[PDB]
Write a protein that binds this ligand. Structure first.
Ligand SMILES: Nc1ncnc2c1ncn2[C@@H]1O[C@H](COP(=O)(O)OP(=O)(O)O)[C@@H](O)[C@H]1O
Ligand SMILES: [Mg+2]
Length: 378
């Protein structure tokens, strides 16, 4: 019985297993090595992952996402109230506990955030099981370093609802450090900086590792900065461009904007390894095709202030840990947005030419570390 490592992410989740000496990051049924943290409810079925995200434009009120922003928080919580204003789905109050309310098979039903996340965890569990060819009952699940007891508990519960014995709940930055084998240094304190630019959040952590024991020395960043913000700059740019070429504003067509958003995210992803990208959407708005392109340099310009803003939390965390740039032994890249060449440059330049540990797919580093730790704990 291999136990599994699960990164239960805000925007994407990832599952790994350590067996026969190495970590396998397990692809899902569509061949994707990470899976959106999305759960959809329709007249006839419950969809999770890619199947949920791939119908988001068609079903906005009953496609749930961002459950991680609610998990283990009270309804009265100001982050909750505030985050609520921007979701297309209803959150409601059940004894100061938030529930996401949707319609499923024709009826209004309401779920706790840990219930939604348990459906994502079940999907990651079944992904793992399809590959291993047996049931998985033990898992290590990861959380942000700043998660309080009640968010850790609610995440553990999500695991238990999913039919997993949760061997441990560990910090995301520690799991990334474990992935790179930094946990096995000894006697001396090593200082490690995790730079984590994901889909919805930006986390900088400084850890000190001394004879295998981790200490979180500083944390910083921005809980609303991530790849979604870069998708948006691109969306706004192409909306303006559509207006220029056809004198038509797609702004208010919720469906056109979501399909444009989708095309942008995919274009963006291509710009991490190519210097130009094709954007081709059939019948975007009133039967008008939108066939166009964008360069890495143009996308960089559109995002230049957001990209730069990531170095301020780095300065802050260094200050709060009372360390200079030159006392950081290792720079680890985590999150899919750190595949962006400009971002790697900014961080490497900030650190005066220092290597970045980026050999492990950054959107997988946390799951990789969880999988290593799960095997150890077993
Ligand atoms: N090659 C790439 N270039 C730029 N962004 C990417 C790339 N691959 C994935 N992403 C982005 O990474 C983000 C998801 O990051 P990930 O670490 O998987 O999830 P999470 O933030 O939920 O932990 C998304 O915004 C996605 O578009
Ligand atoms: Mg992440």
């Amino acid at each position: 019985a291999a136990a599994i490592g699960i990164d239960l992410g805000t925007t994407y989740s990832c599952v790994g297993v350590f067996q026969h000496g190495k970590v396998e990051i397990i692809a899902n049924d569509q061949g994707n090595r990470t899976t959106p943290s999305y759960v959809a409810f329709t007249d006839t079925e419950r969809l999770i992952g890619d199947a949920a995200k791939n119908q988001v434009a068609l079903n906005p009120q009953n496609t749930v996402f961002d459950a991680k922003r609610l998990i283990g928080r009270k309804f009265g919580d100001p982050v909750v109230q505030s985050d609520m204003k921007h979701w297309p789905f209803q959150v409601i109050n059940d004894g100061d506990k938030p529930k996401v309310q949707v319609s499923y098979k024709g009826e209004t039903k309401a779920f706790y955030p840990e219930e939604i996340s348990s459906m994502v965890l079940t999907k990651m569990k079944e992904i793992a099981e399809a590959y291993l060819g047996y049931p998985v009952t033990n898992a290590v699940i990861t959380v942000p370093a700043y998660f309080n007891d009640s968010q850790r508990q609610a995440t553990k519960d999500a695991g238990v609802i999913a039919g997993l014995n949760v061997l441990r709940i560990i910090n995301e930055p520690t799991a990334a450090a474990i992935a790179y084998g930094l946990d096995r240094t000894g006697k001396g304190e090593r200082n490690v900086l995790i730079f984590d630019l994901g889909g919805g959040t930006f986390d900088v952590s400084i850890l000190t590792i001394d004879d295998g024991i981790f200490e979180v020395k500083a944390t910083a960043g921005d809980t609303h900065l991530g790849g979604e913000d870069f998708d948006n700059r691109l969306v706004n740019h192409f909306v303006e461009e559509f207006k220029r070429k056809h004198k038509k504003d797609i702004s208010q067509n919720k469906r056109a904007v979501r399909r444009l958003r989708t095309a942008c995210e995919r274009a963006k992803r291509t710009l991490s390894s190519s210097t130009q990208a094709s954007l081709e959407i059939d019948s975007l708005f009133e039967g008008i095709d939108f066939y166009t392109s964008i360069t890495r340099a143009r996308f960089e310009e559109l995002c230049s202030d957001l990209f730069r803003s990531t170095l301020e939390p780095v300065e802050k965390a260094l200050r709060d840990a009372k360390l200079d740039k030159a006392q950081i032994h290792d720079l680890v890249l985590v999150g899919g947005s750190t595949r962006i060449p400009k971002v790697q440059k900014l961080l490497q330049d900030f650190f005066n030419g220092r290597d970045l540990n980026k050999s492990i797919n950054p959107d997988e580093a946390v799951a990789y570390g969880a999988a290593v730790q799960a095997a150890i704990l077993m």
